[PDB]
Every structure is written in C-alpha cells, then in structure tokens.
Amino acid sequence: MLEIVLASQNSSKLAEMQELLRDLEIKFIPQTEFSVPDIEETGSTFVENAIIKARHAAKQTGLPALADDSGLTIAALNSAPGVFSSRYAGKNATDAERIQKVLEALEAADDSDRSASFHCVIALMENENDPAPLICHGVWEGEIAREPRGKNGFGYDPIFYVPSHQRTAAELDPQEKNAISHRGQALEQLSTVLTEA
C-alpha cells in the first residue's frame, strides 16, 4: 500500500481525495497523524505555497507528501485577492466580510470587467529533496456577481457566477460544484497521473 501524507487539516479535502482514489492502492495520511505542525505560506503564487507545504510534510514524515493551495483571482483587481484570498479582509474575518470587501473593491475599481477565476494547485513530492514535484493546476473561470446568492459551499462561492450554469457556485448542488470546480479539475488531473502509474 502506497502511503502519501496529506499536508491539509481539512476534513473535506481528505474525504474528496479518498473518494477520488477509491480504486487505487493508496492511503492518504493527514500530517497531523505524524504531529507535523502547519508551516507558514510565504509564497506569492499558489504553486509556491503548495510546494512549501508538501516539502515540509515530506521532510518531517519521511514519506511522499501532497499539498494544495487555492484562491480567487479577479481580473479587474490585478488577480487579487490571489494568495491573499483568505487574508483579504484582515485576520479573524468571516467569509461574509471577505465577500463584502471583494464587492467594494470591484465597486471602487469601477471596471466593467467582472471576470474572475478560482485556482487549485496541487503539488506531490516524492520526498523533501524532490526537484520535480507533480504539479496539477485546476482553473475555473467565472464572473463576480453584484450580490451574494446561494446556500451551499463556503468562502467566495456566493459571488462566483458560473456562466455555464447561469448560477453562482453557492447555488450549485455540492456534487455538481465538486465535479466542475478548480479543485475537481486539479483532482482529476492528479487521478489520471496516479491511475496511469
């Protein structure tokens, strides 16, 4: 049984992964099971943070490690909030607060372009010295709505309008969102590689 450490403490991320690779002989183990502490994300790109976290987990555990970083990028805001997606409305802020700051920022930029994208970058390291980690990059293109809509999901989901569905991410059923999202796409890229291996 191939053992891979998951850097994330996020339970939904682990569950999504187990579901994804259910037919493969691979076992994901949260880094917390090795008492690995979180490491600070200091990169300016998702890929840099994904690597930082995977390399850390691999270093401490001695096993292969997989990490991801994700965020919302808005064209009119020069790709902000980007890697500051979680920090966009200050520390200790809520999802609702962050949504409002994004809406205000666009309002202030008064730029007709509401284009935006969700990104998920997964990095898989064989060990901490791996110079060529597997990189999977999922991209989900949409638009920022004028006001929050939808009961599902989390974070910026309520203002992420999905043109193909004429609904926001928060309006989609969970399964449908997870099938077409930036995470879904990254995960399918990962599965293709792992399955082939």
Report the binding-site residues for Mg(2+).
40, 69
Annotated binding residues: 8-13, 40, 69-70, 154-157, 177, 182-183
Shortest reach from residue 79's CB to a second copy, in Å: 6
Of residues 38, 69, 95, 130, which has the active-site annotation? Answer: 69
Shortest reach from residue 6's CB to a second copy, in Å: 19
Q: Which of 48, 95, 176, 188 contacts a second copy by CB under 8 A?
A: 48
Quickly count: other Cβ atoms within 10 Å of residue 110's Cβ. Answer: 7
Q: Rounded to whole angstroms, how far apart are CA atoms 193 and 197?
A: 6
For residue 80 the two structure tokens come to: 């902000």
Active site residue 69: yes
Going through the chain in order, the beta strands assigned E by DSSP cover: 2-6, 26-30, 65-74, 115-125, 134-144, 160-162, 167-168
Q: Which of 131, 151, 175, 197 contacts a second copy by CB under 8 A?
A: 131
Shortest reach from residue 115's CB to Ca ion, in Å: 22
Shortest reach from residue 19's CB to a second copy, in Å: 26
CB-CB contact of 129 with 150 (8 Å) = no
* 4 touches a second copy by CB under 8 A: no
Backbone angles phi, psi at 125, to 5 degrees: -105, 135
What's the length of the chain?
197
* 139 touches a second copy by CB under 8 A: yes
SS3 at position 115: strand
SS3 at position 76: helix
Q: Which residues does the annotation mark as catalytic?
A: 69
Which residues of the shown chain bind a second copy in the complex (CB under 8 A)? Answer: 44-48, 51, 55, 71, 73, 78-80, 82-83, 117, 119, 121, 126-127, 129-133, 135, 137, 139
For Ca ion, the binding residues (CB under 5 A) are 69, 86
